[PDB]
Amino acid sequence: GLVASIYRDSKRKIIRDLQKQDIQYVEYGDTRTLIIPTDKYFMSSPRLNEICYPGLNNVIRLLNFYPQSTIYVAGFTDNVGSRKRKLSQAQAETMMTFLWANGIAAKRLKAEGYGDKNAISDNAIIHGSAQNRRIEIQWFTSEG
Amino acid sequence: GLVASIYRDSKRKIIRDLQKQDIQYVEYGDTRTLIIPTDKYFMSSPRLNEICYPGLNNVIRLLNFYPQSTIYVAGFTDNVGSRKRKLSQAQAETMMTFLWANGIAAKRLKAEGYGDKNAISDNAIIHGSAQNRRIEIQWFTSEG
Numbered sequence A, B: 001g002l003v004a005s006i007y008r009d010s011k012r013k014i015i016r017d018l019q020k021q022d023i024q025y026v027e028y029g030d031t032r033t034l035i036i037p038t039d040k041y042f043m044s045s046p047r048l049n050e051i052c053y054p055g056l057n058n059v060i061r062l063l064n065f066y067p068q069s070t071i072y073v074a075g076f077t078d079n080v081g082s083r084k085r086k087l088s089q090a091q092a093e094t095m096m097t098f099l100w101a102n103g104i105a106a107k108r109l110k111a112e113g114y115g116d117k118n119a120i121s122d123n124a125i126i127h128g129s130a131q132n133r134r135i136e137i138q139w140f141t142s143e144g
Helices: A005-020 A046-052 A054-063 A085-101 B005-020 B046-052 B054-063 B085-101
Strands: A024-028 A031-037 A071-076 A109-111 A134-140 B024-028 B031-037 B071-076 B109-111 B134-140
Touching: A005 A024, A005 A054, A031 A054, A046 A054, A046 A085, A046 B085, A054 A085, A054 A134, A071 A085, A085 A109, A085 A134, A085 B046, A085 B085, B005 B024, B005 B054, B031 B054, B046 B054, B046 B085, B054 B085, B054 B134, B071 B085, B085 B109, B085 B134
Parallel strands: A071 A109, B071 B109
Antiparallel strands: A024 A031, A031 A134, A071 A134, B024 B031, B031 B134, B071 B134
């Protein structure tokens, strides 16, 4: 305790800042999910993104709370259309390279198989442009 | 012949256009290498790059001349410094996702192990900003 006092308090603030930075954090059961609006976070140099986007920087800090969890990433530009699972798989890779480049063990990063039933798509939860173009980062924790 | 007449002529033009678009093509033996200046080709959406950068579009067309060759990609932001093989491995992944997203078999794409002796670094050959920040795409062909 104390160094569990500081950690819990920090995490709550990171989550709140992410919220203000338009990044949603969804929690239910042992599932944790970050929903990133791709129209705001265009994303090549990890340096440009770290330096210019505080939100992406806050995503790293949060993922650093779970250094033992496998991090799953899903892409969804799945709004443009007709029959593009490609560009989705694509931006998912973009996020992964960014996460890796910024300290996340490559072994921990995994790309969600397209159409992965675990991905969130509920418009009751997803708000704004994220309903159309977005990236999701999901992991499982036993902190509860 | 004829459809070998058109192909050879097209390839020579692609190479020439790439040259005008500041992308160098180096040939020697069975080795082929593209040198892309990262200050000009910033690179997340494959659509933005395809649509806005004719040169990157010409790189795809050229790689489509070798649909059976393994495509190696090396990154070099290895100018910024001191002891960043990361960001290099990083932009190499960026190029790969872009190539894949645009039609290049994922099986054909491979990331060069950092410090791969095959990469070109000769300033007699590499010109301009590419001497500092660049991406290279190398493959081997038996066309000769």
